Design a binder for this molecule. Structure first.
Ligand SMILES: O=C(O)c1cc(Br)ccc1NS(=O)(=O)c1ccc2c(c1)CCCC2
Length: 88
């Protein structure tokens, strides 16, 4: 029962305006993590992690443009953000 290295992270976003991440690729990967963001504060998500799902949206075959657009609309809405990432 070796780990599949799939981790799910729920951020409450009460104290943070933004995830504070950049993304690369077209899978979609965490390119970098910004200081002062909810992701940096939580600390679980790292650069090179592959983005599988954020809230109700799957990211597995999505353009970089479409990924940036969807993430803004998700971060714009108030309430928790759940990210599912592949660490392998
Ligand atoms: O929240 C992010 O880090 C983010 C990442 C990508 Br990739 C695309 C969009 C993102 N969110 S965002 O709504 O554009 C955003 C980015 C920065 C900030 C905000 C929103 C809110 C004010 C503080 C600075």
């Amino acid at each position: 029962a070796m780990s599949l290295n799939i981790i799910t992270v729920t951020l409450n976003m009460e104290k943070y305006n933004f995830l504070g991440i950049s993304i690369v690729g077209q899978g979609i990967y965490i390119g970098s993590i910004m200081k002062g963001g909810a992701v940096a504060a939580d600390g679980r998500i790292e650069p090179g992690d592959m983005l599988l799902q954020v809230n109700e949206i799957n990211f597995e075959n999505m353009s970089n443009d479409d990924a940036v657009r969807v993430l803004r609309e998700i971060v714009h809405k108030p309430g928790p953000i759940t990210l599912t990432v592949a660490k392998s």
